[PDB]
Amino acid sequence: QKIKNCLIEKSSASLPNNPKTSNPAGGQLFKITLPESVFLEEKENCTSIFNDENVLGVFEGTITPHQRAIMDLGASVTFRSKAMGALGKGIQQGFEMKDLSMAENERYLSGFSMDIGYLLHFPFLLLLQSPFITKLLGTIRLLNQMPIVKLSLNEVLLPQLNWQPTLLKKLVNHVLSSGSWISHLIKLSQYSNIPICNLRLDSMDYIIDVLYARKLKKENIVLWWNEKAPLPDHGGIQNDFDLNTS
């Protein structure tokens, strides 16, 4: 077609193995890379390669730019620009990262020295401790622009009689555990290579997911990564009833 300013290339990535899809046929998998803005533009028109006849599947449409950068670069990102001195140009505009990127060693992330705050609900690197993160974030729009470490302990309960002492006790430990929270967060982050604020403490499957995904990307295997969905992303064949899967 040549109409799109993208990069396509025939690839041999190892596909997943859905029980229904078993016929070998041939191999003509492709590796189309294309910026998301013109992808949204191409969503509009009827005729385009991504939506035409004889399309078997799209296999990694679920992964967001956030996940791509947190998996590729990591916490310790550095600039290998050289060429023309566009550091000022890079900082005034948005630094495009595809052309120039490198991931430096993160053996020591930070020698911590910074102020910490609180914000709690019982229905600057601030720590958000609320049952409803989304509601508090939406109600105060100014809360979005500040960096927050979101640690959520939820479902407060009351005996309905003499609740003042139990409120005091529930407040005391949350007041006094700040030194432990930050210490454990840094301890996990220094090995994890995920940035501190994106990472959560109780979240443990996320570490496994990122590590397994990036060590898979070291190989040619396809991720089948799927976001906030209980089923794997197999290209759309996963949306049909099958006896073996059942």
């Binding site: 969905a229 759309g236 009833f241 099958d242």
Partner: protein, 551 residues
């Protein structure tokens, strides 16, 4: 029947029963019971003043009481309801519209030997069903596809063009030549070869030199008309032509079935007798067009997400305009959640079922503002793939076609904030006067595109193809039990032998359209939000529609 007399003197029925007996039991009617006789004493005593020697009054009262029993079927014995019919009599001196779910729809079998529909008693009414009464019996699994084949073959054999005729497959076991017209299920044998199956038997099919009739879809699990030659050296029917059974309009279909009240709003039918009615249809067609264009019911764009904030804001802006002119009916359709809700083993966060409950509590806040829309509008709730009970098993996939309504436990006070709200199954039938509309929500175009026969050899054409296949096959599920399981005893819900007058067929994978075919109208709402635009369409029972957008 009149008032203002002196006072209601009390008299014993012994001095009243002879007149009632002579008027009712002797001439027309019978069985004036003792309790019923005592009941008929009060109203005749209401105007008792200067009577039992008067002229017409008592005779006319008995005549009027007989009028109800000729009008209503009732029975023989007269019971304490005798006052209940006089309440109707004094009553004599919109409505008739209903929404029928999948479960409450009447069941009808078909006898091929008799060319007629036989009633099936509902197990809920007579069976105890205290512990397990919804569960089918194994015999339905054996007749599920036989019923489809009988209905389609009757229609094929009553077509005008056919009078070569369709031959049973086993009649081909000794022939070495000639031509045959075979009708049956297209599927794959357990060996992996394409085959055709009819109640008589089965045969393998060769597609190597087949020329299909373009204009529709050839998916496994549907009836197909085929033509070719049978070779006895092996067992193969070499195909030379392929088509689909022709469709039939409902006006010519009704006459064959008489005037059966399938979606009976005129009355109900039992194992004894059936119901038919013709004269009322003319007058109610008159009433449909009797300057009732004010009626206005609206189907929203499918797949609207409550958890998203922008969708909620757009819905508030839309209800802002809907408040001005309240729709007659408002159908909220599509999945109400953007993520399937399952057991959610992790309890650190709030449970997904509690989140489902909470997302149905913001609707009350957003709806309580607009009082008129509450006061004079009826809302119809359609489920979706990611609702509560189904997603607990399918995990967002599409499974059984008869999908039960949303549980009343997690949605309780939306019935209070709004006046008329009805929860309905995934396939439902709106009976509006002399009109039947079918509500169905699934992605049909994707499944058609994925599963095609692929014969070895502008986008709106696909919409016409989909409409023609769905309408000619006379069934909403032209698929085998493998692709989509079906509740065995509820399959009649999905069979369109009489073509509906108006069809609601929403598919997010297919662009919106407005097509007409043999006696029906097919509309496609879909994709509530698209290209930063929120769309919703209006339709009027006078066969005009409108599209209204609100960024």
């Amino acid at each position: 029947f009149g008032s203002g007399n002196v006072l209601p003197v009390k008299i014993q029925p012994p001095l009243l029963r002879p007149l009632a007996y002579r008027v009712l039991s002797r001439k027309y009617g019978l069985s004036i019971k003792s309790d019923g006789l005592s009941a008929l004493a009060e109203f005749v005593g209401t105007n008792i003043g200067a009577n039992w020697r008067q002229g017409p009054a008592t005779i006319k009262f008995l005549e009027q009481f007989a009028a109800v029993w000729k009008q209503q079927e009732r029975g023989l014995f007269i019971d304490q309801s005798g006052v209940k019919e006089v309440i109707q009599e004094m009553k004599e001196r919109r409505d008739y519209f209903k929404v029928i779910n999948a479960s409450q729809q009447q069941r009808f079998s078909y006898n091929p030997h008799k060319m007629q529909f036989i009633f099936v008693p509902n197990k809920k009414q007579n069976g105890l069903g205290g512990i397990a009464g919804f569960l089918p019996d194994i015999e339905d699994k054996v007749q599920m596809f036989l019923t489809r084949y009988y209905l389609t073959n009757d229609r094929v054999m009553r077509n005008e063009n056919f009078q070569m005729s369709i031959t049973p497959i086993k009649n081909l076991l000794g022939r070495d030549a000639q031509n045959f017209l075979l009708l049956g299920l297209l599927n794959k044998n357990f060996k992996g070869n394409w085959s055709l199956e009819d109640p008589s038997g089965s045969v393998e099919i060769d597609i190597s030199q087949t020329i299909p009739t373009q204009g529709h879809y050839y998916v496994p699990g549907c009836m197909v008309l085929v033509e070719g030659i049978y070779y006895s050296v092996g067992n193969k029917f070499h195909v030379t032509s392929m088509t689909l059974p022709p469709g039939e309009r409902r006006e010519i279909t009704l006459e064959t079935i008489g005037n059966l009240d399938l979606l009976g709003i005129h009355g109900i039918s039992n194992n004894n007798f059936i119901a038919r009615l013709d004269k009322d249809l003319k007058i109610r067609l008159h009433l449909l067009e009797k300057e009732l264009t004010d009626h206005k019911f609206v189907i929203l764009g499918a797949n609207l997400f409550l958890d998203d904030l922008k969708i909620m804001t757009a819905l508030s802006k839309i209800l802002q305009k809907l408040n001005d002119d309240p729709p007659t009916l408002l159908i909220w359709q599509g999945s109400f959640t953007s993520v399937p809700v399952f057991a959610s083993m992790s309890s650190r966060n709030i449970s997904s079922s509690t989140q489902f409950k909470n997302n149905f509590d913001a609707l009350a806040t957003l709806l309580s503002r607009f009082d008129n829309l509450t006061e004079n509008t009826t809302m119809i709730f359609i489920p979706g793939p990611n609702d509560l009970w189904g997603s607990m098993v399918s995990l967002g996939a599409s499974g059984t076609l008869p999908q039960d309504p949303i549980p009343s436990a997690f949605t309780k006070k939306i019935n209070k904030v709004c006046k008329n709200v009805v929860w309905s199954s995934n396939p439902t039938r709106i009976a509006y006067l002399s009109q039947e509309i079918v509500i169905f929500r699934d992605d049909l175009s994707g499944r058609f595109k994925r599963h095609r026969l692929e014969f070895p050899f502008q986008k709106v054409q696909e919409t016409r193809k989909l409409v023609k296949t769905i309408l000619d096959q006379g069934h909403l599920s032209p698929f085998l039990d493998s692709l989509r399981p079906i509740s065995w005893d509820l399959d009649h819900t999905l069979t369109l032998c009489p073509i509906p007058s108006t069809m609601v067929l929403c598919d997010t994978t297919s662009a919106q359209f407005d097509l007409t075919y043999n006696g029906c109208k097919v509309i496609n709402p879909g994709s509530f939000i698209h290209n930063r635009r929120a769309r919703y369409m209006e339709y009027v029972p006078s066969s005009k529609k409108t599209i209204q957008e609100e960024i």
